[PDB]
Enzyme design. Structure first.
Site, PDB file in Angstrom:
ATOM      1  N   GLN A 150      -3.789  16.167  -1.011  1.00  0.00           N
ATOM      2  CA  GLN A 150      -4.710  17.008  -1.907  1.00  0.00           C
ATOM      3  C   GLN A 150      -5.959  16.303  -2.532  1.00  0.00           C
ATOM      4  O   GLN A 150      -6.983  16.743  -2.787  1.00  0.00           O
ATOM      5  CB  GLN A 150      -3.964  17.627  -2.963  1.00  0.00           C
ATOM      6  CG  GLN A 150      -4.497  18.445  -3.983  1.00  0.00           C
ATOM      7  CD  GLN A 150      -3.880  19.456  -4.656  1.00  0.00           C
ATOM      8  OE1 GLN A 150      -2.665  19.277  -5.025  1.00  0.00           O
ATOM      9  NE2 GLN A 150      -4.573  20.422  -5.404  1.00  0.00           N
ATOM     10  N   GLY A 162       3.880  11.837  -1.864  1.00  0.00           N
ATOM     11  CA  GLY A 162       4.017  12.918  -1.055  1.00  0.00           C
ATOM     12  C   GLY A 162       3.268  12.571   0.343  1.00  0.00           C
ATOM     13  O   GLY A 162       3.765  11.522   0.805  1.00  0.00           O
ATOM     14  N   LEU A 172     -19.701  -2.834   6.637  1.00  0.00           N
ATOM     15  CA  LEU A 172     -18.315  -2.606   5.967  1.00  0.00           C
ATOM     16  C   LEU A 172     -17.418  -3.977   6.524  1.00  0.00           C
ATOM     17  O   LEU A 172     -16.575  -4.091   5.894  1.00  0.00           O
ATOM     18  CB  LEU A 172     -17.742  -1.261   6.647  1.00  0.00           C
ATOM     19  CG  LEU A 172     -18.076  -0.151   5.789  1.00  0.00           C
ATOM     20  CD1 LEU A 172     -19.501  -0.057   5.258  1.00  0.00           C
ATOM     21  CD2 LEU A 172     -17.415   1.131   6.449  1.00  0.00           C
ATOM     22  N   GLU A 174     -18.322  -6.819   6.341  1.00  0.00           N
ATOM     23  CA  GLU A 174     -18.492  -8.021   5.561  1.00  0.00           C
ATOM     24  C   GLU A 174     -17.555  -7.919   4.369  1.00  0.00           C
ATOM     25  O   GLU A 174     -17.402  -9.089   3.809  1.00  0.00           O
ATOM     26  CB  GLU A 174     -19.922  -8.024   5.220  1.00  0.00           C
ATOM     27  CG  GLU A 174     -21.115  -7.846   6.303  1.00  0.00           C
ATOM     28  CD  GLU A 174     -22.553  -7.979   5.864  1.00  0.00           C
ATOM     29  OE1 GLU A 174     -22.624  -8.088   4.716  1.00  0.00           O
ATOM     30  OE2 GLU A 174     -23.311  -8.094   6.919  1.00  0.00           O
TER      31      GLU A 174
END
Ligand SMILES: Nc1nc2c(ncn2[C@@H]2O[C@H](COP(=O)(O)OP(=O)(O)OP(=O)(O)O)[C@@H](O)[C@H]2O)c(=O)[nH]1
Ligand SMILES: Nc1nc2c(ncn2[C@@H]2O[C@H](COP(=O)(O)OP(=O)(O)OP(=O)(O)O)[C@@H](O)[C@H]2O)c(=O)[nH]1
Ligand SMILES: Nc1nc2c(ncn2[C@@H]2O[C@H](COP(=O)(O)OP(=O)(O)O)[C@@H](O)[C@H]2O)c(=O)[nH]1
Ligand SMILES: Nc1nc2c(ncn2[C@@H]2O[C@H](COP(=O)(O)OP(=O)(O)O)[C@@H](O)[C@H]2O)c(=O)[nH]1
Ligand SMILES: [Mg+2]
Ligand SMILES: [Mg+2]
Lengths: 430, 432, 432, 430
Positions: free
Chosen positions: C11, C137, C245, C247
């Protein structure tokens, strides 16, 4: 913020309180239905000091009405501004106290005090910042003297740091309205001197003089007297609700007005007070307001300040005024009456100026005076109490409810000590 | 380039600040907001943003929230930065202990952070301006608490404070002697120069020279607003002989513990009676030394001067200033202490004082503000200490102070320190 | 060319994703559908089809089917590919075992296939963005199940995850300590860099800085939406000093088991109080290091920094960035670990952050997102381990976990691993 | 999906159930004829949780009504929302149980249980994903106590993994309505502790207080009490039927509310509850709703939480609210009452927020509390049971139906063990 929660007691408190909430609602634009219709927005900014909000603009006073008999409140809720109060706040028993302190404090109110506290805590916990508790009662009755002091002890033990101010009606010296007044007063005072911060002593006889002499009222009901008490109760809590050139919080007064812990009994006053025909012969300016404030004929307590000395004084002005005039008048009073002010306090006056006056008045002022002359009141009660107690005048009504004769002796000793303390600090240095 | 951080404490400081920042906004063409209409030296007091909005470099702090709440609803609601205006839960209730030990502890860490966010935003830090009351409450405890905090975070940076010193006769609180001594004891070692004013003294001036029988607090503040403008005019405007806030410390404070100058402002004249006055430099300069014009009800001739700062404004010729001071030095009644042959610091500025619309002062051409350190103020301290001694001897109100974080001993330590200071003023005033 | 696969679990992830993809569609002119009105760098997040419809490169997975069922009925019903939205029979019921062993086994083979159909459709694969809850969960079991599956199918490909770390005081589930430790034990060896946020910390920010007393979950998500946009702005837009990303892994993770940076976003300011702020580069940079602005309720000054990534946006001058970082390095209170003299990775982008209509943030000109790895987070792990120890000592809720595919031993192994990690954080923080 | 099948029992269950299906049908727009006429489409999306569909828009509840006497259901089907139920689901015998557990469980219901199961399996097998079984009954009667527990054992043996939640009316301490209550309660509880996942203990006396004190109702029928029970039964199953910022499935509650297998007895609550005249004196906001939720006077079980400690708690909110307020209030309650919460559970509150409130209310909340104070209820029943059992007060009515005295001893021992276990986990660590 700085919320005040109002507690009633007995018939006297409930009757005074019902008038106080009619006056307060008037200066905040609150209709008897709870809706707000004021013009100035300032009266709404600090409306949370006494009122809680609800849906639809309804405002609910933070008031707790309690009596051992429901006849009095049934009058309150049936009368004007009675539907305003929250129904859950009417906490009451069935069998009233027979004007005896023992029944209200130990037997009848003891089993009902818990019901009241459960409402007080619920009211208090809804406050963003709780300033203190405001109690209205009478020392001559049974519910107010007995239960009112029982509540005071309970709240003080539960909210030690908060300020608790009592507006108590004191038995008059001239004529009584209850044969057992000395027992109720002495026992009630034994509790007040230990569990309250500032007690505003008033008596009906003095208010009768004010209506007769100053207001020239020929048919003074209890509504007229209660309006006078309401005005002074509104005055001492105006800085919390309105802005001014110089503010005075309830704790601000207590610090400036209570030198020693036990000398916290004040005799209030109000001004201007003029008849309907004498209004066109008055200037209505600061110099005269300050003149009648210190007039012994315009004070709501029997004791005359001329018989003693002022330990301290407070003058909470209202309306837009010249700060220069206010300070000059207070200094002028200080100089002329230098014999009436204790000397080991270099300055005996605390001043404040609120910007908004009461409805229909351009100017107003509330006087609060801590005077050693109050010792007369307690000494007079001591004389009556010891007279009755010397030969067990009415004890069986008290000892039968759970009290004991030892408590009677302790109460008298404590009151005598307080009278001694007030007398002791009436003498100059060394 | 230059900067001044204004901290306004209590009801007095906040209400005095309202007048100061109504004057500054007027001295710079500002429009009651941060906006300037379709005006360049403001940078000393006003920070600037790309929106064209100028943000005052001030901090309003109060434990009570009625006075500041009125600013947020006033005409200057949209001027100050909302986080500059700091309000508490419950006031100090005329109690020094509450302001310094119980309630101040819950706000000091908040005001000090906003000061930090201002100190690091200045190209160069010059000093602090503190406005507060001496009567008590926040002004006595919170300030001494704040002053000690500024003394460590900023060390040697200048700390100037404007105090509403208690009047000799007039009083509005019963415990002023307790608060006055307690705050002084904790501010001697953390303050550089404290400028004193009395409500009573300005009350006399407002009716004796300005023709007004009904002075409100707004009138007194507007008079104090002019003084601070004059003190900071050198930073804000150009002049022939400028003076900087760090110069007052050395010029007026001969000794570290004697830093309590008086204040004066000569051309306090009604508009109508100004038509019959020349208002020349020599006459206004002489008015500063008259007891009838002091803003503190302490008579200079009861003692000896020790330092004087004459901050002229408007159309002033330095030759006239030289002559007027020369004559004043000649007068025998005006007595300076022997060990200070060099008695005067002079400052001249080209900007005439501006008159607030709806105000009482006249549209003067030239004005002088005098900041004099005198031994006469020793009498005021002695009078104040006497009042404290009377109350404390009986422990008149001690229980309130002891029960809210303070202690019994601090009353003795504070008073003896004031005794030493009163002794120090005597030693300074005697020679050989 | 570049790509990022967004997996939203539970959720929290699904509702956080709703905000992320409302921002991305706004950052690219998209019209709440795949359509662009009559806008070229979208390719990193949006796949394109000949119809003119842009399909988000994301996978929404949940065992519960109420939150995702709301998307299918929402305004973005026609945006996502229907097979991206994966829903199960019955939720995990705040139980890690159900998410990882019983229910996850029936969906993992389905979500992994849709990931496969996306991985092979990319010109070049850069990494994975995982949004999930730490409370438990699906977010605790399914993720650790999915993370292990991605670690083998894609090996060395970057795996970045955004976790809603449990708050210190606030809590919404009774068994969070069980789920938090169990998922962490199974994600240390399969995750590259986990960015932490706390609901309580953002709750403080949303009222302390944004003037809102009624933050919903939509408000928190919109704040998290900005952060992810800043992290991926370099791929999506042009800049002076870009960052990829891959790095972050080397810049922020000194050791394989210590990869839990905090998060920050400085200009979180109300629109009204922004008019009184300059919002210059040095000030916002300093705000990142204040405990009052962290998005995780862990105080940095309780520990030592180990790495920092400053991702600026909008109108920013690299000279100012150099100065601001230089001053921050000077401050002694801001303590970096000794063995990391090189403390900062910097990234600058030309695209100012975009404000979501109906949002709360102001229309800022420049913004900075800070991703800092600190030893202070060791305190949070210790606090979390204490809560787990209390419950487990009594076997407070064990019977639920043991009876749904798990085993008693795993509780001991998970906790001791957390003890080792807490020990590791201590060794890293000590020198010589 | 996540379908719930409702089982009735006895007169209590049938009367409660008939009201539950009137409330549920109201929030889903289902007419008494079965047609749908709701406005919001959201109430129709998850309508399959309780209802089965038919031609023409008719929706049929997944309810099984059973009693050993048809007088009660004949009232059900004759009353409003009675024609809604499927006629085949009315499974009943001719000779009722004489308020004795033995007859309902071993003799009378034994021969009828198979008829019920054949309907339960048929209902369950029509569910895409069966969430669990919902049983409403009473422990003091014969059908509900005996047959209801017989069904529980049968279904648990046939659907071991599914969640089974019971909303059981418990005998009140003040006054009884059946002389053999201790036997029915003790024997029924002996079965519940082993064959159900979460039991919601309620008692009429507590609901009488709520109507008298809070609602200020002067003529509280059983319809009013059953509406209160209906509201809490609707509350705990709203996440399954409506969306929210934070959902809570039945298994989600059981995991968070049941630390140990046998401590699964809850005492529910509801808010807001206000009289018709006191509605205009209330804010109707989260802070006050959370305040009366934990008030011992607003709980539907006799046992007062102040006498023990909360093992766990759940707060299923309804209506659009600030999540910040909800968490702050739950934390605020946690801090103030730290003595009332067990210490070896760091967090004792499970929170949920549904988006759709009950009809006519902007906000609502359902409280579920697993408290060690419940041990008082079972201990009180143990005292009554052992009193009667000590001298064979009424055994011959039970042993004559097939029971044996050994079963009586086993039931008492098991109940005492459960009381011991609840007491044991009321003490802090070490
Ligand atoms: N000149 C001037 N003085 C003021 C003004 N308001 C208050 N004062 C002075 O302040 C003195 C007392 O201190 P206050 O400022 O009133 O009290 P405080 O600083 O708010 O501290 P608290 O007692 O906690 O409220 C009084 O004696 C006044 O002379 C003002 O508007 N102008
Ligand atoms: N920031 C943010 N956090 C959320 C949101 N929704 C849930 N959370 C967090 O999620 C934590 C619990 O995990 P959940 O996401 O609710 O549970 P789940 O991932 O769906 O797994 P299940 O228990 O099987 O439903 C809570 O403690 C919340 O703090 C949201 O919309 N925004
Ligand atoms: N001013 C005023 N005084 C009252 C009123 N009612 C009672 N008193 C005073 O209260 C005293 C009687 O005590 P009472 O309050 O009636 O007894 P209680 O009901 O037990 O508290 C007498 O001294 C009265 O003068 C009232 O309505 N107004
Ligand atoms: N709230 C409520 N309680 C009931 C109702 N009918 C019976 N009870 C309770 O159920 C108990 C009697 O058992 P009962 O169910 O009638 O016996 P059964 O038919 O064999 O299950 C008593 O404690 C009653 O208080 C009802 O309609 N509403
Ligand atoms: Mg004040
Ligand atoms: Mg879920």
């Amino acid at each position: 913020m700085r919320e005040i929660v109002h507690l009633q007691a007995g018939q006297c408190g409930n009757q005074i309180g019902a008038k106080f909430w009619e006056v307060i609602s008037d200066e905040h634009g609150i209709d008897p239905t709870g809706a707000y219709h004021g013009d100035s927005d300032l009266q709404l900014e600090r409306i949370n000091v006494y009122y809680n909000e609800a849906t639809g603009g309804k405002y609910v006073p933070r008031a707790v009405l309690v009596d051992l008999e429901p006849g009095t409140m049934d009058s309150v809720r049936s009368g004007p501004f009675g539907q305003i109060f929250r129904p859950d706040n009417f906490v009451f028993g069935q069998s009233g106290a027979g004007n005896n302190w023992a029944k209200g404090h130990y037997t009848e109110g003891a089993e009902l005090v818990d019901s009241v506290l459960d409402v007080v805590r619920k009211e208090a916990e809804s406050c963003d910042c709780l300033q203190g508790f405001q109690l209205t009662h009478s020392l001559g009755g049974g519910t107010g003297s007995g239960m009112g002091t029982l509540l005071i002890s309970k709240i003080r033990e539960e909210y030690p740091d908060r300020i608790m101010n009592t507006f108590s009606v004191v038995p008059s010296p001239k004529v009584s309205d209850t044969v057992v007044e000395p027992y109720n007063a002495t026992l009630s005072v034994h509790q007040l001197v230990e569990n309250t911060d500032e007690t505003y002593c008033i008596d009906n006889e003095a208010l009768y003089d004010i209506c007769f002499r100053t207001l020239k009222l020929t048919t003074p009901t209890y509504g007229d007297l209660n309006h006078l008490v309401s005005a002074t109760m509104s005055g001492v809590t105006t800085c919390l609700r309105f802005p001014g050139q110089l503010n005075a919080d309830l704790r601000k007064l207590a610090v400036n007005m209570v030198p020693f812990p036990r000398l916290h009994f004040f005799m209030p006053g109000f001004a201007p007070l003029t008849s309907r025909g004498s209004q066109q012969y008055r200037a209505l300016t600061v110099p005269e307001l300050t003149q009648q404030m210190f007039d012994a004929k315009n004070m709501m307590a029997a004791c005359d300040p001329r018989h003693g000395r002022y330990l301290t004084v407070a003058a909470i002005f209202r309306g837009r005024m010249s700060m220069k005039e206010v300070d000059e008048q207070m200094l002028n009073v200080q100089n002329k009456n230098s014999s009436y002010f204790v000397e080991w306090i270099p300055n005996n006056v605390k001043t404040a100026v609120c910007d908004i006056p009461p409805r229909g008045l351009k100017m107003s002022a509330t006087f609060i005076g801590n005077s050693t002359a109050i010792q007369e009141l307690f000494k007079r009660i001591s004389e009556q109490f010891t007279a009755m107690f010397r030969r067990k005048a009415f004890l069986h009504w008290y000892t039968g409810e759970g009290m004991d004769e030892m408590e009677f002796t302790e109460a008298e000793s404590n009151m005598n000590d307080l009278v001694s303390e007030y007398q002791q600090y009436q003498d100059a240095t060394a | 380039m230059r900067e001044c951080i204004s901290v306004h404490i209590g009801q007095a400081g906040v209400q005095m600040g309202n007048a100061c920042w109504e004057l500054y906004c007027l001295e710079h063409g500002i429009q009651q907001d941060g906006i300037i209409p379709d005006d360049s030296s403001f940078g000393t007091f006003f920070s600037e943003t790309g929106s064209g909005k100028h943000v005052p470099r001030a901090v309003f702090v109060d434990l009570e929230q009625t006075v500041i709440g009125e600013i947020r609803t006033g005409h200057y609601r949209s001027l100050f930065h909302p986080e500059q205006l700091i309000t508490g839960k419950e006031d100090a209730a005329n109690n020094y202990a509450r302001g310094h030990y119980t309630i101040g502890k819950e706000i000091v860490d908040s005001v000090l952070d906003r000061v930090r966010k201002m100190a690091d935003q200045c190209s160069g830090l010059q000093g602090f301006l503190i406005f507060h009351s001496f009567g008590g409450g926040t002004g006595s405890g919170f300030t001494s608490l704040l002053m000690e905090r500024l003394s460590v975070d900023y060390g040697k940076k200048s700390k100037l404070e404007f105090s509403v010193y208690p009047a000799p006769q007039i009083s509005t609180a019963v415990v002023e002697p307790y608060n006055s001594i307690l705050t002084t004891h904790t501010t001697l070692e953390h303050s550089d120069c404290a400028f004193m004013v009395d409500n009573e003294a300005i009350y006399d001036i407002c009716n004796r020279n300005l023709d007004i029988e009904r002075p409100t607090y707004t009138n007194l503040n507007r008079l104090i607003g002019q003084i601070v403008s004059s003190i900071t005019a050198s930073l804000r405007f150009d002049g022939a002989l400028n003076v900087d806030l760090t110069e007052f410390q050395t010029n007026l404070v001969p000794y570290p513990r004697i830093h309590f100058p008086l204040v004066t402002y000569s051309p306090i004249i009604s508009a109508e009676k100004a038509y019959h006055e020349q208002l020349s430099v020599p006459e206004i300069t002489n008015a500063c030394f008259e007891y009838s014009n002091q803003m503190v009800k302490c008579d200079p001739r009861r003692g000896k001067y020790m330092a004087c700062c004459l901050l002229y404004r408007g159309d002033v010729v330095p030759k006239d200033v030289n002559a007027a001071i020369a004559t004043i030095k000649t007068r025998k009644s005006i007595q300076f202490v022997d060990w200070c042959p060099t008695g005067f610091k002079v400052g001249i500025n080209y900007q005439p004082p501006t008159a607030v619309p709806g105000g009482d002062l006249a549209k003067v051409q030239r004005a002088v503000c005098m900041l004099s350190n005198t031994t006469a103020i020793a009498e005021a301290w002695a009078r104040l200490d006497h009042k404290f001694d009377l109350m404390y001897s009986k422990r008149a109100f001690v229980h309130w102070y002891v029960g809210e974080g303070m202690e019994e001993g601090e009353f003795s330590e504070a008073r003896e320190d004031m005794a030493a200071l009163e002794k120090d003023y005597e030693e300074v005033g005697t020679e050989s």
